[PDB]
Amino acid sequence: TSSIVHLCAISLDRYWSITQAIEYNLKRTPRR
Q1: How far apart are CA 12 and CA 15, in angstroms?
Q2: Which domain of life is it from?
Q3: Which residues neighbour 25 within 8 Å (Cβ) at sequence distance 6 or greater?
């Protein structure tokens, strides 16, 4: 129970900053 969150704490941040500024790198240099 407690031996999870701690982990989730690690395997999460990675997908935090990006999320926030995801639009920053989504569909750059659009070709149309």
Answers
A1: 5
A2: Eukaryota
A3: 18
- Give the separation between CA 22 and CA 16, rounded to whole angstroms: 9
CA separation for the pair 12, 5 (Å, rounded): 10
In the PDB record, what is the listed experimental method?
A: NMR
The per-residue b/e assignment along 4-31, b for 16 or more CB within 10 angstroms, e otherwise, is eeeeeeeeeeeeeeeeeeeeeeeeeeee
* Helix, strand, or coil (residue 24): helix
Residue identified by tokens 């900053």 is 17
* Gaps in the chain following residue numbers (C to N > 2.5 A): none
